[PDB]
């Protein structure tokens, strides 16, 4: 009831959007891959993503997924949303991971209701998160 069970887990580079210079940034400030978990809390039925770097476990992605979050399937590997700070881009080391991971944050949300390109609108404009937090 007071714990979180792994509904989904994909290897990826997680990235953050730099709005004023129109980049991407390895999230965490160093390069590498990241273990992504969507996480399901058994008592409060909310989900959550958490991504923590292979390396040394620094946690780059920590974020509570809102009714009505733009999950932007932008490529086949590399998806994009938001949160109240932060664009997010994970760039998949597969195909498969980034379908199973998709699959499964497009499923939560219905519980709940220069390789890479930028977001769009409808991602930095998403306001999902203010549902939140209240």
Same mark, same amino acid.
């Given at each position: 009831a007071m714990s979180e069970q792994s509904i989904c887990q994909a290897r990826a580079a997680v990235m953050v959007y730099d709005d004023a210079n129109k980049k991407w940034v390895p999230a965490g400030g160093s390069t590498g891959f990241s273990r992504v978990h969507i996480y399901h809390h058994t008592? &409060? &039925?909310?989900?959550?993503?958490?991504?923590?770097?292979?390396?040394?476990?620094?946690?780059v992605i920590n974020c509570a997924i809102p009714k009505g979050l733009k999950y932007n399937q932008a490529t086949q590997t590399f998806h994009q949303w938001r949160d109240a700070?932060?664009?997010?881009?994970?760039?998949?080391?597969?195909?498969?991971?980034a379908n199973v991971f998709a699959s499964a944050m497009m499923?939560?949300?219905?519980?709940?209701?220069?390789?890479?390109?930028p977001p769009p609108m409808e991602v930095l404009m998403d306001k999902s998160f203010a549902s939140l937090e209240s």
């Open positions: 008592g &409060n &039925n909310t989900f959550r993503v958490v991504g923590r770097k292979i390396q040394d476990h620094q946690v700070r932060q664009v997010y881009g994970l760039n998949f080391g597969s195909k498969e991971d499923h939560a949300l219905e519980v709940l209701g220069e390789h890479l390109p």
